[PDB]
Amino acid sequence: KHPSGIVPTLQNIVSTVNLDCKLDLKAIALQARNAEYNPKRFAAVIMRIREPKTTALIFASGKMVCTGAKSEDFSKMAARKYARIVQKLGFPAKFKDFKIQNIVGSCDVKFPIRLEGLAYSHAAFSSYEPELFPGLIYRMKVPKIVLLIFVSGKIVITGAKMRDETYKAFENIYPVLSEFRKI
DNA sequence: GCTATAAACGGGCA
DNA sequence: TGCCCGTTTATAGC
16 A cells, blocks of 8 residues: 555645534634634634644634544544534534544654755646745645645645545655755 | 645635 | 635645
């Protein structure tokens, strides 16, 4: 599955779930010692839990965004704990349309990269302006994934809805990275 | 921390 | 409309 012998580590998962019931955000902010609520700044109650370590953004619509988990399973579990906390605050919340929205991964190929040469040979997919950001932004089309490539050989892979896309994008880029290994 | 990346969410504003 | 508003996370030069 990983011909490269390297498996990108999952670092952050963004998911959403529909609690399916309108929410009184001021009421949640009061009853919960866990919550943070600043309406003029953002229309959401910000809640956090230690295990799995995540941050939830809860809206009046009943929609909820779960961030920070290390896996899809962890992200769903976390979203479930938030749903229960809300149910317990006195809201008839369900757990409708749970959906993984973004998976962020990273790995180390353990060799330096000639970013400029790589960008020049893949102009249609590359954005490299070292004065603004030290990483080369590689917008792959298949799968539709963005990789941030650094001189150190460290790689960030983001935009995936399924972990296999994270893996395929890395496998696709591996031989390109090797071709432009800084010697 | 600022710079940049992806994604979801909502209120506010030109 | 189409932005930024928020939060998360790896990464690194400023």
